[PDB]
Design a protein around this ligand. Structure first.
Ligand SMILES: [K+]
Ligand SMILES: [K+]
Ligand SMILES: [K+]
Ligand SMILES: [K+]
Ligand SMILES: [K+]
Ligand SMILES: [K+]
Ligand SMILES: [K+]
Ligand SMILES: [K+]
Ligand SMILES: [K+]
Ligand SMILES: [K+]
Ligand SMILES: [K+]
Ligand SMILES: [K+]
Ligand SMILES: [K+]
Ligand SMILES: [K+]
Ligand SMILES: [K+]
Ligand SMILES: [K+]
Ligand SMILES: [K+]
Ligand SMILES: [K+]
Ligand SMILES: [K+]
Ligand SMILES: [K+]
Ligand SMILES: [K+]
Ligand SMILES: [K+]
Ligand SMILES: [Mg+2]
Ligand SMILES: [Mg+2]
Ligand SMILES: [Mg+2]
Ligand SMILES: [Mg+2]
Ligand SMILES: [Mg+2]
Ligand SMILES: [Mg+2]
Ligand SMILES: [Mg+2]
Ligand SMILES: [Mg+2]
Ligand SMILES: [Mg+2]
Ligand SMILES: [Mg+2]
Ligand SMILES: [Mg+2]
Ligand SMILES: [Mg+2]
Ligand SMILES: [Mg+2]
Ligand SMILES: [Mg+2]
Ligand SMILES: [Mg+2]
Ligand SMILES: [Mg+2]
Ligand SMILES: [Mg+2]
Ligand SMILES: [Mg+2]
Ligand SMILES: [Mg+2]
Ligand SMILES: [Mg+2]
Ligand SMILES: [Mg+2]
Ligand SMILES: [Mg+2]
Ligand SMILES: [Mg+2]
Ligand SMILES: [Mg+2]
Ligand SMILES: [Mg+2]
Ligand SMILES: [Mg+2]
Ligand SMILES: [Mg+2]
Ligand SMILES: [Mg+2]
Ligand SMILES: [Zn+2]
Lengths: 134, 57, 74, 48
RNA sequence: GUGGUGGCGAUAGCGAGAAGGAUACACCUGUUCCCAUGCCGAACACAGAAGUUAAGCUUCUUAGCGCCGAUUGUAGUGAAGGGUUUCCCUUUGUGAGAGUAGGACGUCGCCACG
RNA sequence: GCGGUCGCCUCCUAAAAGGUAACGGAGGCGCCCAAAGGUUCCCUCAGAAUGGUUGGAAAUCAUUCGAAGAGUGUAAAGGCAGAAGGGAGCUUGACUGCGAGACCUACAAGUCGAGCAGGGACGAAAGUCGGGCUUAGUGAUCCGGUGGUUCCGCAUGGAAGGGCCAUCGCUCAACGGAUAAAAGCUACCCUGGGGAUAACAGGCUUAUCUCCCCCAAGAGUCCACAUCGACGGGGAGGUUUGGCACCUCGAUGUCGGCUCGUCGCAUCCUGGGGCUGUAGUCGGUCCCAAGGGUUGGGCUGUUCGCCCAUUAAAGCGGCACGCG
RNA sequence: UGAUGGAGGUAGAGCACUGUUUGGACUAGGGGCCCAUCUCGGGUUACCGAAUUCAGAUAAACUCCGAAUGCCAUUCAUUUAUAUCCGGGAGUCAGACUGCGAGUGAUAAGAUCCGUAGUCGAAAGGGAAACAGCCCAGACCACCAGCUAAGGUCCCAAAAUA
């Protein structure tokens, strides 16, 4: 996952404080994975979690990725001193704040869903918990 | 009516506005006491430095 | 390459509401008409709002979503 | 090509005004009715 | 009642529907006249009063949209403190946005004809 | 050092006044316009649908829908549909002498300005006009050129030459401009300073690096976990490649070797043990264990590495990459 | 310090604009298959699918909104005692750390660069074992007097084996 276009190549790291503004409830799926901490999440982590969840589900049911890695983070190569401008964009992240429902799943029985979400959570860096649609 | 304000906490390390408020009330050394009218302005000053003083009637 | 920036133009209000000012005092510096010239107030060549006469400054709203400066002599 | 120029008063030959014109757009000498402070009245000023 | 003309944040609006022209206002009849169209008397200008409320306009119904919007709670936050201190928590004061109860199909003047 | 930058304008950083840095993130300027200025009058956009010769997605035309989603010379922000956008007529206020008072400000400068007078443009009048929707489009002084001038004129009259006013000559762009005029080598070097500032070692940090793990898609005939384990996740260590510049520049000697060792254990051998895809002999993996031992040469300054020949084994690291 | 009035778009939040973005509905349209080819019209992939719409996110350089604070001001109020202006004499232009808000960095550094408050600098004393910058607190002096702050009370070691 990578945005097709960006208004600005380089972006602030930002700060993550408090609960997520929105997306704290399950919208489409029957079950969801809620972040209990705040952390950056990379497109790689999102993709790894998504693949794990789908593989276990056996292409049964539907999977929604609520988060998207809009933000870009840069880096400086080894052996490069401080200064001389910002680094080149290295990767893409989604700042996820606690309470966000990162993934949703439907069309699968409850026990399969719980195991699938468990695998996805182990791939992600944040501590998580399973949430049922209300 | 009246307020007896006594400075129970040192002003060292405090914001300039709080130091100025204590001075405006007219308190000097620690445990220095003063008597003032219970006006809205005076009670406002006391509230500004409420953590540094004790107020009696 | 970045690293350029123009000098700040010290825009904004130069007189407070309810303040007495002399004729010709600058009330508000701006780009475009963020606030409009009201009574006894002129707008300079570069959108600066100034008092045409002595009086007290008053910022009001011009209708629903626009502002206005007036100078009222006493 | 835009160039600075001087408008001289025809009546008194006084170089009262400075301005600029685009030569290509205005090949001919510019002429304006401008106030001549020396004569204190409007006169024809021609570029020189 | 209508026509001019203003004040007030659209609570004056928009949408939909209904009624009226007695006067008034309009459409409306014309281009000889002043005047006019980068062509057109469509418009602007002028002259004039056969017809019509059809439209505009006026009055009225409507909460569909737009607009206004209390209280409660919450986010943030000044001040004073704490913790396991990229953050989080407590006391105190302040307190949104959102979402709602609701409000509202205007009101305050002056003139002229009735 | 190389590269980049140097003045000016706009935005974000900037923490709801103003201001506010970084070799922070984005862009622009060194002009253009005789109308793209002034004024009087007049007008309202972009797109979409429907219909329509050439004509096509899209040329021009018509109706409706359309509040700005257009335009505003030129970057961006702010602003403008009572227009600052668009069109027409007339014009030259893109005026002269100023200017109460303000903003900005170390100075020099910079910005705004009602209003007074002179003489005008437009308009019936009100009234507007000292350029352009606003904010860049610029350069001190010295020196010199051109024009004007009721100023001065070394005994006097002239003159020569100055003054004053107006204006021209700057990529003085290192843009408050050293001079009218200027590039290099030094390991033959020297002096005054600095740990304000680099190279060695120390310190902080741990991205990287080494090691240890979590999840388990898989490989393993079957069988995730004997063994290996993708996509991902989390740590420890302070031996690597690095970052910072805190001690040392009135001196902390730098590789390798030799002599002497000592310590850590993430154990190379030996000892104990579990699991095994352990028949036995061999092993693999993991657990405990630092008592002792852990090589002699060829090549290269070498460390490292390759090779020869051995050994139970030929461990990995720290100690100023121990030890001048 | 209070009361009152203001200017401003941050925190937060929001999607009304602009970017980024998820899923669903529908679909212009585009894809190859065959019939028909003058390539003319289909009928197709739950083929790819703009626009619209529904639902859901996201933003330093987005805003329909919008604080707390701070700021400007008042012939205002209470308390306080400084503010200007003129002149003589300076020194300073290496700052450090801590807390809070940002950037750079890797949301590393006792890193770097700003904003804001404090301390050190130029501050002795008590606490943090020792420990400029943290916590409490500002030494004119004498005392073999007393009350407290931070921090403490079993022994070193003053005070609860409360
Ligand atoms: K996790
Ligand atoms: K007519
Ligand atoms: K009608
Ligand atoms: K209404
Ligand atoms: K014109
Ligand atoms: K220079
Ligand atoms: K040499
Ligand atoms: K060393
Ligand atoms: K580490
Ligand atoms: K471990
Ligand atoms: K098995
Ligand atoms: K040295
Ligand atoms: K074994
Ligand atoms: K051993
Ligand atoms: K050798
Ligand atoms: K050798
Ligand atoms: K050793
Ligand atoms: K030696
Ligand atoms: K939006
Ligand atoms: K913002
Ligand atoms: K002085
Ligand atoms: K600080
Ligand atoms: Mg600026
Ligand atoms: Mg101008
Ligand atoms: Mg509300
Ligand atoms: Mg500001
Ligand atoms: Mg501020
Ligand atoms: Mg224009
Ligand atoms: Mg003579
Ligand atoms: Mg002589
Ligand atoms: Mg310079
Ligand atoms: Mg030689
Ligand atoms: Mg020397
Ligand atoms: Mg020295
Ligand atoms: Mg140093
Ligand atoms: Mg040392
Ligand atoms: Mg430093
Ligand atoms: Mg010495
Ligand atoms: Mg061990
Ligand atoms: Mg030999
Ligand atoms: Mg050594
Ligand atoms: Mg030695
Ligand atoms: Mg925010
Ligand atoms: Mg530092
Ligand atoms: Mg010093
Ligand atoms: Mg001390
Ligand atoms: Mg000392
Ligand atoms: Mg006691
Ligand atoms: Mg004791
Ligand atoms: Mg006890
Ligand atoms: Zn003349």
């Amino acid at each position: 996952l990578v945005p097709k276009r960006v208004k600005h190549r380089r972006e602030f790291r930002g700060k993550m404080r408090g609960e997520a503004k929105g997306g704290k409830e399950v919208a489409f799926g029957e079950w969801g994975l809620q972040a209990t901490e705040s952390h950056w999440i990379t497109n790689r982590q999102i993709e790894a979690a998504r693949i794990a969840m789908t593989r276990y589900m056996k292409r049964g049911g539907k999977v929604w990725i609520k988060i998207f890695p809009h933000k870009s983070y840069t880096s400086k190569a080894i052996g490069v001193r401080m200064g001389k401008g910002k680094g080149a964009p290295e990767g893409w992240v989604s700042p996820v704040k606690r309470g966000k429902i990162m993934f949703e799943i439907a069309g699968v029985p409850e026990e399969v869903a719980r195991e699938a979400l468990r695998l996805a959570s182990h791939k992600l860096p944040v501590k998580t918990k399973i949430v049922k649609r209300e | 009516a009246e307020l007896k304000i006594t400075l129970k906490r040192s002003v060292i390390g405090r914001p300039q506005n709080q130091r100025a408020t204590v001075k405006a009330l007219g308190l000097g050394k620690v445990n220095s006491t003063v008597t003032k009218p219970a006006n809205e302005a005076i009670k406002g000053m006391v509230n500004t430095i409420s953590h540094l003083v004790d107020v009696e009637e | 390459s970045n690293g350029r920036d123009s000098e700040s133009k010290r825009l904004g209000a130069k007189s407070a509401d309810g303040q007495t000012v002399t004729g010709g005092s600058i009330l508000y510096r701006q780009r475009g008409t963020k606030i409009y010239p009201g009574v006894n107030v002129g707008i300079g060549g570069d959108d600066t709002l100034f008092a045409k006469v002595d009086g007290v400054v008053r910022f009001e709203r011009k209708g629903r979503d626009k502002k206005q400066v007036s100078v009222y002599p006493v | 090509m835009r160039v600075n120029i001087t408008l001289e008063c025809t009546s008194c030959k006084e170089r009262n005004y400075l301005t600029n014109k685009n030569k290509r757009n205005n090949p001919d000498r510019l002429e304006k009715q401008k106030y001549c402070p020396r004569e204190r009245k409007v006169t024809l000023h021609r570029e020189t």
